[PDB]
């Protein structure tokens, strides 16, 4: 009994005895032996024996934790290796590492979490509360649940079963009974996702007929269905510390256009993370804040393409509770700041507090500040108002209430800065271009949101949209007015005009889509004109 | 489980003892002097229900902004708070009550934080003006 | 009767010009004996309360019961929305006024109360 | 409605019909009306009446 039990439990095979030892004494290992042992763990990842594969995966994960640079370099070299065999083997190794991530801690000395430290994941995002949408769609007739006129019931069950998607869930992760497990997947392995995203377009075929693209797609689809956050963590957190929005949005668009679909949970997590990122960026002013918001909004309208339980009422209520709802929807009403505080060119000089009505151009404020500060008319063109905190240079003909819709106790702080007129015009052009792109993104987001809703609820959604649109104070001006003065500029006028034609076309599309949703006998007054 | 006739009589007596006149209305700031003087089944333990007492005070303070409150208002507030609202209210009324109490909790917490700010801002209001004087000098 | 004045003053003006000092000594306060007449001119329970409540008007439990969440984002939001006018620049100091982990412990703030 | 909800509505109506106590007087100031009030509110007087 003793020997048989020992051989059946403690010694499954003799081959993985050495590697496993290194797991037990991981804390004592020096940085040099980690690199010395890394090649063997990397090579032994495809062993048929499950025990050897698990031991190698655990050892490689510990090596990556201790020496991220070496593992990152090796992974990048393998994914960019000239031969197909090496790249396919690297993809398979990544899959094995992913599926062996939950079996690392048990393999080492008991209670090693205190002696061995894994830094907690760092996130500055506060996901919207409550959760915006359904976390997943329950299968209509799950064959792995014990619970549960006959012919009709069977017909209904079959018809509903045909409409579902069995391949969109982690099958093997749902059947298991539910009576904690900790996952060690350091951030330097998640970087391997991008090479796989690129590989999705690699058509090379091995001598046995397996294509790299097919394997990559299968692996990443399985990873996404099993745990979306773990794979899409190293990107969401990283973007906060660096201004690499363009690259990440490019990568996500490639992911969308190569997998061809997003399961409900994956799109849900991505949408919540992106919304939280926008909320954080508006929340904590930063140098590249507005650019990041514009970039994120430019793509959000595709993520919203695949979401199931997103309804107008819930979204409106939760996002309003967050109170920073004016940056996502267009049917948002927010009384703007009543007063504005501005400092002069110098330091510690007597600032000025000025009133703000609902139809005040920045031209009047600039004129009042200029005259109040005893400035000669000759150098009038050299002074511009700007927001130092958010690093915004302001256009003359933009309403105060639109740029500062927040009616808080604290008025926005402006500064009267001096600089060359040409640079000021260039910066104004850039910022208005970014803001117009953001507005186009918001319109596209609303289009996508209102183009996927059960037909039964579509009439109610469109009626609600019409009501909020009608009750918005300055909608016709918002959708019709354009910054005519900047079009004449030769350097940047053409781009602004080309982006405004698209904005107007999208507005027309929005109104036409809204019109069709409503009934054919709606009682209309004169307000129809407003649309 | 519900307010009894004796409780109503006792509360009326306490109101008459704190309401000097027969105007039927008292300044809101005086109403706390009602809650803690109430005895018997309606008594509130200051050593265990500090949070609840403050919540009631601000709930009646918020009902009308700094306005005088009538006998019926405080009576209804105590009546609501003396019952298991989850069991004795309709769905919509229960939701409204829950949202109202949640808002009151957050508001009173950030009001304590407002007092903390009062102190801290009074402390910090020296350095900036001293630097202003240095710049002028 | 109890430490809080509400139960003090139902008896202080029902059980008993100078004897009432005995209840004042419960709070640890010994004002001038002549001043005992000064408030007695209000003679009335509600008036006595209105006077001496603001007289006394002129800690960690609350700190631990307000930690109902508090990173930079949440602190910034709650802080700007708090109330009376305050220039937001000073909030920059508030975020820096120790561990630098992005979390705030109100116990340290209560320690720093003075 | 559950009978508990019916009781809640009944109590709400009872509180609606409720009114503040009628007599606010201070029976301590005088030396003549004071004892008269003290004896007047004694329950035994009402019982004998």
PDB file of C-alpha atoms in Angstrom, chain A residues 78-300:
ATOM      1  CA  UNK A  78      10.893  32.980 -31.765  1.00  0.00           C
ATOM      2  CA  UNK A  79       7.803  34.735 -33.137  1.00  0.00           C
ATOM      3  CA  UNK A  80       9.985  36.518 -35.721  1.00  0.00           C
ATOM      4  CA  UNK A  81      12.053  33.414 -36.487  1.00  0.00           C
ATOM      5  CA  UNK A  82      12.600  32.866 -40.239  1.00  0.00           C
ATOM      6  CA  UNK A  83      11.310  29.285 -40.402  1.00  0.00           C
ATOM      7  CA  UNK A  84       7.651  28.329 -40.077  1.00  0.00           C
ATOM      8  CA  UNK A  85       8.367  25.447 -37.700  1.00  0.00           C
ATOM      9  CA  UNK A  86       9.852  27.725 -35.042  1.00  0.00           C
ATOM     10  CA  UNK A  87       6.909  30.142 -35.151  1.00  0.00           C
ATOM     11  CA  UNK A  88       4.313  27.365 -34.970  1.00  0.00           C
ATOM     12  CA  UNK A  89       6.217  25.749 -32.098  1.00  0.00           C
ATOM     13  CA  UNK A  90       6.302  29.099 -30.290  1.00  0.00           C
ATOM     14  CA  UNK A  91       2.535  29.471 -30.696  1.00  0.00           C
ATOM     15  CA  UNK A  92       2.004  25.962 -29.325  1.00  0.00           C
ATOM     16  CA  UNK A  93       4.338  26.726 -26.412  1.00  0.00           C
ATOM     17  CA  UNK A  94       2.308  29.842 -25.634  1.00  0.00           C
ATOM     18  CA  UNK A  95      -0.878  27.769 -25.653  1.00  0.00           C
ATOM     19  CA  UNK A  96       0.658  25.239 -23.254  1.00  0.00           C
ATOM     20  CA  UNK A  97       1.849  28.019 -20.943  1.00  0.00           C
ATOM     21  CA  UNK A  98      -1.634  29.546 -20.972  1.00  0.00           C
ATOM     22  CA  UNK A  99      -3.358  26.275 -20.086  1.00  0.00           C
ATOM     23  CA  UNK A 100      -0.824  25.470 -17.320  1.00  0.00           C
ATOM     24  CA  UNK A 101      -1.021  28.844 -15.553  1.00  0.00           C
ATOM     25  CA  UNK A 102      -3.221  27.640 -12.669  1.00  0.00           C
ATOM     26  CA  UNK A 103      -0.861  24.819 -11.617  1.00  0.00           C
ATOM     27  CA  UNK A 104       2.244  26.757 -10.544  1.00  0.00           C
ATOM     28  CA  UNK A 105       1.733  27.592  -6.865  1.00  0.00           C
ATOM     29  CA  UNK A 106       0.906  24.004  -5.770  1.00  0.00           C
ATOM     30  CA  UNK A 107       4.128  22.672  -7.303  1.00  0.00           C
ATOM     31  CA  UNK A 108       6.399  24.648  -4.954  1.00  0.00           C
ATOM     32  CA  UNK A 109       6.887  24.760  -1.197  1.00  0.00           C
ATOM     33  CA  UNK A 110       3.678  25.167   0.803  1.00  0.00           C
ATOM     34  CA  UNK A 111       2.740  28.734   1.671  1.00  0.00           C
ATOM     35  CA  UNK A 112       5.293  30.235  -0.710  1.00  0.00           C
ATOM     36  CA  UNK A 113       3.158  33.308  -1.433  1.00  0.00           C
ATOM     37  CA  UNK A 114       4.630  35.044   1.625  1.00  0.00           C
ATOM     38  CA  UNK A 115       8.256  34.140   0.869  1.00  0.00           C
ATOM     39  CA  UNK A 116       7.893  34.583  -2.914  1.00  0.00           C
ATOM     40  CA  UNK A 117       6.381  37.889  -4.017  1.00  0.00           C
ATOM     41  CA  UNK A 118       4.348  38.409  -7.192  1.00  0.00           C
ATOM     42  CA  UNK A 119       3.438  42.105  -7.625  1.00  0.00           C
ATOM     43  CA  UNK A 120      -0.333  42.628  -7.774  1.00  0.00           C
ATOM     44  CA  UNK A 121      -1.738  43.807 -11.113  1.00  0.00           C
ATOM     45  CA  UNK A 122      -1.675  47.597 -11.359  1.00  0.00           C
ATOM     46  CA  UNK A 123      -4.896  49.213 -12.597  1.00  0.00           C
ATOM     47  CA  UNK A 124      -5.923  52.859 -12.260  1.00  0.00           C
ATOM     48  CA  UNK A 125      -9.289  52.214 -13.935  1.00  0.00           C
ATOM     49  CA  UNK A 126     -12.570  52.292 -12.022  1.00  0.00           C
ATOM     50  CA  UNK A 127     -14.912  50.162 -14.105  1.00  0.00           C
ATOM     51  CA  UNK A 128     -18.420  51.630 -14.472  1.00  0.00           C
ATOM     52  CA  UNK A 129     -20.704  50.771 -11.561  1.00  0.00           C
ATOM     53  CA  UNK A 130     -23.092  49.026 -12.096  1.00  0.00           C
ATOM     54  CA  UNK A 131     -21.651  46.805 -14.827  1.00  0.00           C
ATOM     55  CA  UNK A 132     -22.799  48.169 -18.159  1.00  0.00           C
ATOM     56  CA  UNK A 133     -24.009  45.000 -19.894  1.00  0.00           C
ATOM     57  CA  UNK A 134     -24.662  41.292 -19.563  1.00  0.00           C
ATOM     58  CA  UNK A 135     -21.503  39.307 -18.685  1.00  0.00           C
ATOM     59  CA  UNK A 136     -22.656  36.395 -20.844  1.00  0.00           C
ATOM     60  CA  UNK A 137     -25.640  34.772 -22.541  1.00  0.00           C
ATOM     61  CA  UNK A 138     -26.748  31.571 -20.760  1.00  0.00           C
ATOM     62  CA  UNK A 139     -27.143  28.533 -22.980  1.00  0.00           C
ATOM     63  CA  UNK A 140     -30.783  27.747 -23.652  1.00  0.00           C
ATOM     64  CA  UNK A 141     -30.541  24.034 -22.748  1.00  0.00           C
ATOM     65  CA  UNK A 142     -27.229  23.389 -20.967  1.00  0.00           C
ATOM     66  CA  UNK A 143     -26.553  19.626 -20.964  1.00  0.00           C
ATOM     67  CA  UNK A 144     -24.422  20.034 -17.798  1.00  0.00           C
ATOM     68  CA  UNK A 145     -27.065  21.170 -15.295  1.00  0.00           C
ATOM     69  CA  UNK A 146     -29.110  18.595 -13.341  1.00  0.00           C
ATOM     70  CA  UNK A 147     -32.348  20.585 -13.053  1.00  0.00           C
ATOM     71  CA  UNK A 148     -34.864  19.402 -15.649  1.00  0.00           C
ATOM     72  CA  UNK A 149     -47.705  19.625 -24.395  1.00  0.00           C
ATOM     73  CA  UNK A 150     -44.614  17.417 -24.559  1.00  0.00           C
ATOM     74  CA  UNK A 151     -44.098  17.511 -28.330  1.00  0.00           C
ATOM     75  CA  UNK A 152     -44.560  21.291 -28.399  1.00  0.00           C
ATOM     76  CA  UNK A 153     -42.050  21.666 -25.563  1.00  0.00           C
ATOM     77  CA  UNK A 154     -39.517  19.519 -27.425  1.00  0.00           C
ATOM     78  CA  UNK A 155     -40.036  21.501 -30.637  1.00  0.00           C
ATOM     79  CA  UNK A 156     -39.564  24.790 -28.784  1.00  0.00           C
ATOM     80  CA  UNK A 157     -36.444  23.467 -27.066  1.00  0.00           C
ATOM     81  CA  UNK A 158     -34.927  22.303 -30.361  1.00  0.00           C
ATOM     82  CA  UNK A 159     -35.716  25.575 -32.135  1.00  0.00           C
ATOM     83  CA  UNK A 160     -34.192  27.626 -29.326  1.00  0.00           C
ATOM     84  CA  UNK A 161     -31.170  25.321 -29.229  1.00  0.00           C
ATOM     85  CA  UNK A 162     -30.499  25.898 -32.926  1.00  0.00           C
ATOM     86  CA  UNK A 163     -30.324  29.658 -32.300  1.00  0.00           C
ATOM     87  CA  UNK A 164     -27.530  29.423 -29.704  1.00  0.00           C
ATOM     88  CA  UNK A 165     -23.739  29.179 -30.122  1.00  0.00           C
ATOM     89  CA  UNK A 166     -22.064  26.299 -28.287  1.00  0.00           C
ATOM     90  CA  UNK A 167     -18.610  27.165 -29.670  1.00  0.00           C
ATOM     91  CA  UNK A 168     -18.583  30.619 -28.022  1.00  0.00           C
ATOM     92  CA  UNK A 169     -17.940  29.474 -24.427  1.00  0.00           C
ATOM     93  CA  UNK A 170     -15.084  27.679 -22.668  1.00  0.00           C
ATOM     94  CA  UNK A 171     -16.800  24.273 -22.716  1.00  0.00           C
ATOM     95  CA  UNK A 172     -14.369  22.504 -20.399  1.00  0.00           C
ATOM     96  CA  UNK A 173     -14.390  25.409 -17.907  1.00  0.00           C
ATOM     97  CA  UNK A 174     -18.188  25.338 -17.424  1.00  0.00           C
ATOM     98  CA  UNK A 175     -19.036  21.651 -16.963  1.00  0.00           C
ATOM     99  CA  UNK A 176     -16.799  21.319 -13.899  1.00  0.00           C
ATOM    100  CA  UNK A 177     -18.731  21.368 -10.637  1.00  0.00           C
ATOM    101  CA  UNK A 178     -18.344  24.374  -8.349  1.00  0.00           C
ATOM    102  CA  UNK A 179     -17.732  23.333  -4.701  1.00  0.00           C
ATOM    103  CA  UNK A 180      -8.738  29.928  -3.981  1.00  0.00           C
ATOM    104  CA  UNK A 181      -6.830  29.312  -7.235  1.00  0.00           C
ATOM    105  CA  UNK A 182      -4.332  32.047  -8.103  1.00  0.00           C
ATOM    106  CA  UNK A 183      -3.051  32.616 -11.640  1.00  0.00           C
ATOM    107  CA  UNK A 184       0.587  33.571 -12.232  1.00  0.00           C
ATOM    108  CA  UNK A 185       0.780  35.054 -15.747  1.00  0.00           C
ATOM    109  CA  UNK A 186       3.319  37.900 -15.621  1.00  0.00           C
ATOM    110  CA  UNK A 187       2.889  40.880 -17.916  1.00  0.00           C
ATOM    111  CA  UNK A 188       5.911  39.922 -20.043  1.00  0.00           C
ATOM    112  CA  UNK A 189       4.079  36.880 -21.445  1.00  0.00           C
ATOM    113  CA  UNK A 190       0.969  38.867 -22.374  1.00  0.00           C
ATOM    114  CA  UNK A 191       3.216  40.800 -24.761  1.00  0.00           C
ATOM    115  CA  UNK A 192       3.285  37.600 -26.840  1.00  0.00           C
ATOM    116  CA  UNK A 193      -0.329  38.307 -27.858  1.00  0.00           C
ATOM    117  CA  UNK A 194       0.668  40.974 -30.387  1.00  0.00           C
ATOM    118  CA  UNK A 195       2.968  38.620 -32.360  1.00  0.00           C
ATOM    119  CA  UNK A 196       0.079  36.137 -32.523  1.00  0.00           C
ATOM    120  CA  UNK A 197      -2.236  38.910 -33.726  1.00  0.00           C
ATOM    121  CA  UNK A 198       0.245  39.590 -36.524  1.00  0.00           C
ATOM    122  CA  UNK A 199       0.617  35.861 -37.232  1.00  0.00           C
ATOM    123  CA  UNK A 200      -3.134  35.540 -37.828  1.00  0.00           C
ATOM    124  CA  UNK A 201      -2.305  36.776 -41.355  1.00  0.00           C
ATOM    125  CA  UNK A 202       0.551  34.313 -41.982  1.00  0.00           C
ATOM    126  CA  UNK A 203      -0.481  31.834 -44.675  1.00  0.00           C
ATOM    127  CA  UNK A 204       2.560  29.549 -44.585  1.00  0.00           C
ATOM    128  CA  UNK A 205       1.659  25.853 -44.342  1.00  0.00           C
ATOM    129  CA  UNK A 206       3.753  23.166 -42.662  1.00  0.00           C
ATOM    130  CA  UNK A 207       4.584  19.930 -44.470  1.00  0.00           C
ATOM    131  CA  UNK A 208       1.777  18.152 -42.577  1.00  0.00           C
ATOM    132  CA  UNK A 209      -0.840  20.708 -43.659  1.00  0.00           C
ATOM    133  CA  UNK A 210      -1.226  22.768 -40.473  1.00  0.00           C
ATOM    134  CA  UNK A 211      -1.268  26.509 -41.171  1.00  0.00           C
ATOM    135  CA  UNK A 212       0.163  29.061 -38.752  1.00  0.00           C
ATOM    136  CA  UNK A 213      -2.858  31.350 -39.086  1.00  0.00           C
ATOM    137  CA  UNK A 214      -5.336  28.610 -38.167  1.00  0.00           C
ATOM    138  CA  UNK A 215      -3.407  27.605 -35.044  1.00  0.00           C
ATOM    139  CA  UNK A 216      -2.957  31.223 -33.956  1.00  0.00           C
ATOM    140  CA  UNK A 217      -6.655  31.965 -34.439  1.00  0.00           C
ATOM    141  CA  UNK A 218      -7.681  28.848 -32.515  1.00  0.00           C
ATOM    142  CA  UNK A 219      -5.333  29.610 -29.621  1.00  0.00           C
ATOM    143  CA  UNK A 220      -6.380  33.242 -29.288  1.00  0.00           C
ATOM    144  CA  UNK A 221     -10.083  32.408 -29.662  1.00  0.00           C
ATOM    145  CA  UNK A 222      -9.786  29.865 -26.850  1.00  0.00           C
ATOM    146  CA  UNK A 223      -7.877  32.359 -24.705  1.00  0.00           C
ATOM    147  CA  UNK A 224     -10.475  35.076 -25.303  1.00  0.00           C
ATOM    148  CA  UNK A 225     -13.425  32.821 -24.480  1.00  0.00           C
ATOM    149  CA  UNK A 226     -11.739  31.443 -21.352  1.00  0.00           C
ATOM    150  CA  UNK A 227     -10.457  34.649 -19.715  1.00  0.00           C
ATOM    151  CA  UNK A 228     -10.707  37.956 -21.598  1.00  0.00           C
ATOM    152  CA  UNK A 229      -9.185  40.110 -18.857  1.00  0.00           C
ATOM    153  CA  UNK A 230      -5.991  38.073 -18.452  1.00  0.00           C
ATOM    154  CA  UNK A 231      -5.084  38.435 -22.132  1.00  0.00           C
ATOM    155  CA  UNK A 232      -6.340  42.029 -22.508  1.00  0.00           C
ATOM    156  CA  UNK A 233      -4.666  43.287 -19.320  1.00  0.00           C
ATOM    157  CA  UNK A 234      -1.100  44.099 -20.401  1.00  0.00           C
ATOM    158  CA  UNK A 235      -2.497  46.461 -23.059  1.00  0.00           C
ATOM    159  CA  UNK A 236      -5.179  48.304 -21.070  1.00  0.00           C
ATOM    160  CA  UNK A 237      -2.899  49.086 -18.118  1.00  0.00           C
ATOM    161  CA  UNK A 238       0.121  49.882 -20.293  1.00  0.00           C
ATOM    162  CA  UNK A 239      -1.692  52.564 -22.271  1.00  0.00           C
ATOM    163  CA  UNK A 240      -2.096  54.654 -19.127  1.00  0.00           C
ATOM    164  CA  UNK A 241       1.658  55.088 -18.651  1.00  0.00           C
ATOM    165  CA  UNK A 242       2.450  55.933 -22.287  1.00  0.00           C
ATOM    166  CA  UNK A 243       0.946  57.788 -25.247  1.00  0.00           C
ATOM    167  CA  UNK A 244       0.742  54.794 -27.594  1.00  0.00           C
ATOM    168  CA  UNK A 245      -2.991  54.923 -28.311  1.00  0.00           C
ATOM    169  CA  UNK A 246      -2.550  54.666 -32.085  1.00  0.00           C
ATOM    170  CA  UNK A 247      -0.662  51.366 -31.941  1.00  0.00           C
ATOM    171  CA  UNK A 248      -3.058  49.726 -29.490  1.00  0.00           C
ATOM    172  CA  UNK A 249      -6.153  50.782 -31.421  1.00  0.00           C
ATOM    173  CA  UNK A 250      -4.527  49.519 -34.633  1.00  0.00           C
ATOM    174  CA  UNK A 251      -3.848  46.180 -32.940  1.00  0.00           C
ATOM    175  CA  UNK A 252      -7.418  45.910 -31.630  1.00  0.00           C
ATOM    176  CA  UNK A 253      -8.850  46.721 -35.062  1.00  0.00           C
ATOM    177  CA  UNK A 254      -6.645  44.006 -36.560  1.00  0.00           C
ATOM    178  CA  UNK A 255      -7.895  41.589 -33.899  1.00  0.00           C
ATOM    179  CA  UNK A 256     -11.504  42.426 -34.775  1.00  0.00           C
ATOM    180  CA  UNK A 257     -10.913  42.136 -38.533  1.00  0.00           C
ATOM    181  CA  UNK A 258      -9.036  38.821 -38.210  1.00  0.00           C
ATOM    182  CA  UNK A 259     -11.139  36.881 -35.702  1.00  0.00           C
ATOM    183  CA  UNK A 260     -14.307  38.189 -37.358  1.00  0.00           C
ATOM    184  CA  UNK A 261     -16.308  38.130 -34.116  1.00  0.00           C
ATOM    185  CA  UNK A 262     -16.196  38.932 -30.403  1.00  0.00           C
ATOM    186  CA  UNK A 263     -17.968  36.655 -27.894  1.00  0.00           C
ATOM    187  CA  UNK A 264     -20.287  38.452 -25.505  1.00  0.00           C
ATOM    188  CA  UNK A 265     -17.909  38.309 -22.533  1.00  0.00           C
ATOM    189  CA  UNK A 266     -14.869  39.501 -24.504  1.00  0.00           C
ATOM    190  CA  UNK A 267     -16.659  42.495 -26.019  1.00  0.00           C
ATOM    191  CA  UNK A 268     -18.227  43.234 -22.631  1.00  0.00           C
ATOM    192  CA  UNK A 269     -14.845  43.352 -20.897  1.00  0.00           C
ATOM    193  CA  UNK A 270     -13.302  45.409 -23.699  1.00  0.00           C
ATOM    194  CA  UNK A 271     -16.155  47.931 -23.692  1.00  0.00           C
ATOM    195  CA  UNK A 272     -16.084  48.318 -19.908  1.00  0.00           C
ATOM    196  CA  UNK A 273     -12.304  48.739 -19.887  1.00  0.00           C
ATOM    197  CA  UNK A 274     -12.424  51.353 -22.652  1.00  0.00           C
ATOM    198  CA  UNK A 275     -15.226  53.294 -20.945  1.00  0.00           C
ATOM    199  CA  UNK A 276     -13.288  53.201 -17.683  1.00  0.00           C
ATOM    200  CA  UNK A 277     -10.205  54.451 -19.516  1.00  0.00           C
ATOM    201  CA  UNK A 278     -12.163  57.407 -20.900  1.00  0.00           C
ATOM    202  CA  UNK A 279     -13.579  58.086 -17.439  1.00  0.00           C
ATOM    203  CA  UNK A 280     -10.099  58.023 -15.897  1.00  0.00           C
ATOM    204  CA  UNK A 281      -8.595  60.289 -18.558  1.00  0.00           C
ATOM    205  CA  UNK A 282     -11.328  62.896 -18.138  1.00  0.00           C
ATOM    206  CA  UNK A 283     -11.030  62.355 -14.372  1.00  0.00           C
ATOM    207  CA  UNK A 284      -7.278  62.943 -13.991  1.00  0.00           C
ATOM    208  CA  UNK A 285      -5.984  65.661 -16.345  1.00  0.00           C
ATOM    209  CA  UNK A 286      -2.905  64.598 -18.280  1.00  0.00           C
ATOM    210  CA  UNK A 287      -0.848  65.957 -21.151  1.00  0.00           C
ATOM    211  CA  UNK A 288      -2.193  63.458 -23.719  1.00  0.00           C
ATOM    212  CA  UNK A 289      -5.700  63.160 -22.254  1.00  0.00           C
ATOM    213  CA  UNK A 290      -7.890  64.591 -25.003  1.00  0.00           C
ATOM    214  CA  UNK A 291      -5.927  62.778 -27.710  1.00  0.00           C
ATOM    215  CA  UNK A 292      -6.422  59.484 -25.871  1.00  0.00           C
ATOM    216  CA  UNK A 293     -10.157  60.117 -25.497  1.00  0.00           C
ATOM    217  CA  UNK A 294     -10.453  60.905 -29.208  1.00  0.00           C
ATOM    218  CA  UNK A 295      -8.517  57.778 -30.183  1.00  0.00           C
ATOM    219  CA  UNK A 296     -10.637  55.562 -27.928  1.00  0.00           C
ATOM    220  CA  UNK A 297     -13.915  57.041 -29.177  1.00  0.00           C
ATOM    221  CA  UNK A 298     -12.745  56.542 -32.762  1.00  0.00           C
ATOM    222  CA  UNK A 299     -12.946  52.773 -32.140  1.00  0.00           C
ATOM    223  CA  UNK A 300     -15.589  52.348 -29.418  1.00  0.00           C
TER     224      UNK A 300
END
